[model samples]
Target chain A: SVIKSDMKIKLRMEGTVNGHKFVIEGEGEGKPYEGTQTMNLKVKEGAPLPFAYDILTTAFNRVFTKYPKDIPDYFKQSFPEGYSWERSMTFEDGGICTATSDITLEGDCFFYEIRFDGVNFPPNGPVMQKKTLKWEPSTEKMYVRDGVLMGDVNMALLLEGGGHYRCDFKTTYKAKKGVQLPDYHFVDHRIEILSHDKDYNNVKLYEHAVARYSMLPRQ
Target chain B: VIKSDMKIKLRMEGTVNGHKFVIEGEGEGKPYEGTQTMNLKVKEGAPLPFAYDILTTAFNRVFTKYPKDIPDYFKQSFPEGYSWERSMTFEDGGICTATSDITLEGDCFFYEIRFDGVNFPPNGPVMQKKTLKWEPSTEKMYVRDGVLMGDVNMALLLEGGGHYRCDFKTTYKAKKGVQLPDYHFVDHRIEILSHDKDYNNVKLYEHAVARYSMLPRQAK
Candidate 1:
C-alpha cells in the first residue's frame, strides 16, 4: 500500500484561541520529497542542549520501537520513500506566507527528517521575511496507509537559549470515493498549544481548520 | 555509595471517579530487592483492566534503590517533581484533562504516586476507570544502578470503550538510593496509543509528553 503520488491542495482554516481570532486560506500542488533513538544527532548545524535533546527525541520517536531491529511488519510493507506537496497560507490579516516541505524516511534506520522553507509577507510590512525550518524525528507524526496521510504530532518547540514550548498539530487526509486521474482527498487539520513549560501554564491556544487535496495518480 | 541496608516503605493510594487502588511496599535489600503488592477495589463488574499484582515487578524495580556510582551530569541537571493539572481540546472538539503527583521519600525511591489520564490520547473517549491502578509497565520490569534501562508495560483501559497494552523502552537516567538527592527522573513517554471501542488488537501513534521533575522523591 505504498503511496507514491502527488496531489493538489486547497485549504481554509478558521479558529479562536483564548478569544483571539484568525483565518487562513491557501492552494497549491505538485512536488515530492522525503531518525534515530541512539541520541546520535545529525543536526545540520548546531547542537541542542542535552536535556532538551533527550525530551525532544523521546517525544518524537515514541511511536516506533526504540530498537531499529524491532520494527513491526505493518511499517515494513506500507512504508514509502517519502511524500511532498506545496501550499501557501493567506491569513486574515493580509499576511500571506507560502511554504513547501520535503520529507524523507529511513524506517530501518529509525529516522525521518523534514526540510521546510518559506517566505512571509507580514501585513503592511516593508520587506518579506524568509524562513527555513527543519524538524527532526519525533518532531511530528506521519500516518500513511493505502490512501491516507494523517499527521498527529506533539512538539517541544525548541527556542534559542534553551527555552521551549509544547504544541500539537494534526492533519487527516482520506481518499475520496469514485474519482479520476485527478481526484480529491478530504483533509482537516487542528493545532493547539498545550503549554509553555513543563507545568501546564503560560499560554493556551487552539485552531481548527479544514482543507482538500486534489491528487495525481502514482507516478 | 548506597549502603546495603536501606529502609523503605512506599504506599500509593489512587482513585478513578471514586473507585480506589492501593500499592503498598517496603524493602531494605540492595540494588533490587523488595516486597510490594497492589490491589484494585471496584464495582463487581467494573472494566478496569488490571490484575492484583500488575505492578509487582515495577514496584520492586522502582522502589528498590541502591545506586553505587551515579553520574555527575545527572546530579546537576536533574529536576524535581511537581503536581500539575492540564486540559486541552483535540480532534472534533473533544476536551481531555490529565493530572499526576508523585512522592520520593528520603533515598527510599518513589514512595507515593498518582495519575489520572496522564498519557491517554487527547481525543479518545472518556476515561471510564474505577479506582484504576497501573504503572507505565504492568509486566516484568528491569533496573540497573537505579537507571530505568528497560521497557515499561501497562494495560490501558478507557471509559468510552477500549482495551489496550503498551510496553515502551525508556532511555532516561535515574537512580534509586538511600535518600538519594535530586535523582534524574524523566518521564519522556512515547507511543501513547488509541484502540477500537472493543477489545481487539490495536495500532498506536506517538503522543509525546515530557516531565523531568515534578514528583517528590523520598525513602524511609
Candidate 2:
C-alpha cells in the first residue's frame, strides 16, 4: 500500500501584503511546526516574486517528507548511517537553470539545500544547507515555522523565477502486480501574484501556505 | 572469409497431372534439366511443365551453398548432424511452400524461416526421411528421382489416371554482400499446358547447376 501524509505547508508573499495573514494550526497526532522569515527585495525588473513563492513552497514540501518523524526508521534499514544532503542542477534554458536539494532520512531531519548557478542568478553566498526541521512521520509531512526555509531556499527561488508557479501536481501510486488502486484526482490550490512591490513583504507567508498543498512522496 | 563452390543441377518430373514429384539425384557438377511433354489429348488443362522447372530450379539455387561442408571433426560442431535436406510443397493454386532443415547463421540471408510451430503449412505433406543424400565434403550438388501422387491425380483421368513429370537443378555461389545477386528479379521461364491427359505424356529435360563464390571477410 502507498502511504501518504502532508509534509510541510507554507505561505509566502511580500511582507507588505499584510492583513492577508491566516494562522493554520492542526494538532491531531504530529510534531510541532517551526517558522522563520527572510526578506527578498526586487533584485531585478520583472522578477517573479509570486512564482518564487510557489516554487519555494513546492521545494519545501518535497524536501520535508524526506525526514518524516513517524517514519524515523523508514529508510534506516537501507541507509543505516542515515541520509546526507544531495543537490543537483537541471538546465532550463540558455540563461536559466533550476537547482534541487533533498533532505534524506539519515539521522533525524537532515537539512538539504539547493542554490541556482547561471548567468541570471549565481550562488551569492551558500548554495544549500542541512538544518533540523519539524516533520511528522505518521503523515509523511513536515510542519515548519511560517518563515523558516526547510529545503534549499535558493533552488526554490530559481523555480519561482522560471514561471513554473501554477504547475500541475502529478501523483503516482505503485502497487504489486495484481494490486491496484481506483483512479482518483487530487486537487490543490495555487496562488500567483503579478505585482512584486505590493506583495514582497508577504511572500514567505504565501510560500508557507502553498507548501501545505504541494505533493511529496509517500512512504 | 566466406567460401563458395559450384554444384551439379538435376531436374525430374512426375507422371501424373496435379500429382507432385520429389526428384533426387547426385553428382559433383552434373546438370539436371528437363521439360514436360504433354500428351495433347485432354480438353482442359494443368500448369505448363516449365513452371515447375523454374520453381524447383530457383529453390535449389537459393539453398545450394547452405549445407556447408566442414571437416569431419569440425562437422560435429553443428547442432544436428552435418547433412540436411529441405522440402517444398506445390499448392493447387500454383503457390509453393518451401522449408529447409538448415540452421540459421544470421540476418545475412534475405529469407527467414519462422520457428513457430503454427507457421508450418497445413496442406503440405509431413516430411519423411528427408535426410541429405550424402555428406559430400567436395561435391557441390547431386540429384535423385521420384514422383508425388495425391487425390488430384485420381480425378485427372476419366478412368482415374493422371501423372506429371518435373526436372530440377540447384546452383550456389558465394558473392560479396554488396555483390549479392538480385533474387527478386531473377528471370524465370513459365509454360502452360492444356489438359491432365496431355500433361501425363509430357517429358521435360533441363540441367541443374550450383556455384560457390567465396571472398575474404574484410574484402580489403
Candidate 3:
C-alpha cells in the first residue's frame, strides 16, 4: 500500500516603517502523520541571522520545489542529495498563527524553516526626557497620558517565498481566542498601517533572513 | 738586436706502392749556420722521402705565405685561438724547419681524431676507387717518364672534406723542400681520396675535424 507523504512549510518575515524596509526569512519542517515540527528562523537584523536563513531556504526550496514532481531531481538539487522528503509544516498568519504545510516522506525527509522579524526602534533610548514648564497663577487643570508605541512586524513566506495566505495581529491589548467585547479596544487603522508597513519590506527582509539561515548547510 | 727565429723542418714519407703515407712535419728554431746543409737519399719505390732541408724550405714557404705578423688574426680565425710554432730538426738530413699551427686540446680532441681516422677507410673506398686508380696509372706515370708537364697541368690542394688550400708545384716529380711530399705521393693521394669519399657517410666527421683544426674560440 502506498502511504501519503507529509506537506512541508517555510516561514519568512520583513517590515517597513517611515519608508525604510528590511526582510528576515526562515523555514521549518514537520511530519504530517506525527505532527512533530522543527522550525528554523532567521531574523534579518543581525549578522549570522542573514547567512542562516539564506542557506535554509536554499536547501528547503530545493527539496520543497522538486520532491513531488521528481524525487531524483529534488535529491540532486539538495546539498546532501540522498535523503527522502519527510512530513513537515510551516506557521503562517503573519506571525500570529502558525500554519502547517504538511509533507510526507517514504523514509527520512529533510525539512527546514526560516523566520525574519523586524523591530524598529533606536538601539538605546531613555525612559524620560527633560521638558520646560510654564507656571500658572490661576486655578487650572492639567492632564498627562504616558504610553509607549513599539512596532513589531513579522511575516512568513512559503515555497519560492510565496504563499501570502495568513494575517497575524498583535497589540498592547490582549484577548483569548474567542472572547472580545470591547468597542474602543480595536484599532483597524493602526493595524492596517502596521501591516502595510510590514508587507512593504517583508519579502526582501525574509529573503535576506532565509539566505543567512541557509548558509550553514551550504557551507 | 732583432733575433731571427729558427727555421722549422719536417719529414714525411710514402711508398709508391704502399697504402699508408708517413708524415713527420717539424719546425726548427733557425736555419743552421755555416755549411749545416740538408742531405736526403731515397731508393726507387721505397718512399717519397722528405729531408730536413726540404722540410725547412717548406716550413719557410708556409710561414712566408702566412706570416707571424698576422698570427693574432690566424688564431682568431682558427679554433682554439692559439697554436704553437715549433722549431723542427731532421737528423737524417741535418735540416731544420719552423712552422706555426694550432694544437689539439682535451680528451675530446684526441677522441675526435681517432674517430675520423677509424671511419675514413671503409667509407672512402667507394668514392675514391676510380680516381685513386687513375692517379698512379696515368698522372704519376706520365710525370715520371720525363714528360714536360707545364705548371698549368699540375695542381696541389691540401684536401680535407672540401679543398682547403690550393698550392702550385712546377716539378713533375716529388722534390726537396716541398711541404708534403708524402701527401703528394700516389698512396697518400689514394688515402685522402678514399677518406673524402667515405666522409660523406661519416656522421660527425666534418664537425669533428673542423672543430679540432679550424673552429675558432669564443671571444671574451
| Candidate number achieving the greatest DockQ relative to the actual structure | 1
Cα displacement (Å) at residue B63, model 3: 1.5
Docking class of 2: incorrect
Please give the lDDT score at residue A194 for candidate 2: 21
DockQ (Cα-based) for each candidate:
0.05, 0.01, 0.00
Ranking by DockQ: 1, 2, 3
Which lDDT value does model 3 have at A210? 8
Full-model lDDT for every candidate: 0.28, 0.22, 0.21
Q: Rank order by TM-score, top first?
A: 1, 2, 3
> Which structure among the candidates has the greatest TM-score?
1
Kindly give the stretch of ten consecutive residues in candidate 3 chain A with the minimal lDDT sum. Answer: A185-194
Q: A102 in model 3: Cα distance from truth in Å? A: 99
Q: Candidate 2, residues B1-220: lDDT per residue as tens digits? A: 1113223223332332234444432223111221112121111224332322222222222222122231121112222212122322232322333332322142111221111111223332212111111101112121112111001100010111121111111222222111222111111121222324324333222221222212111111
Chain A TM-score for predicted structure 1: 0.29
lDDT by residue (B11-125, candidate 3, tens digit) is: 3332111122333322222211101112222222223221111222221211111222222122132224222211111111111111223232321111000000001111122
Please tell me how candidate 3 rates in CAPRI terms: incorrect
| Residues A1-219 of candidate 3: C-alpha lDDT, one tens digit per residue | 122245444444332211123355544454433323344444465322221122122222222221222112222232332222111111231011111111223334433222211111111211011010111111111111112111122222222223232212221111112221211111111001111122122222111110001113533
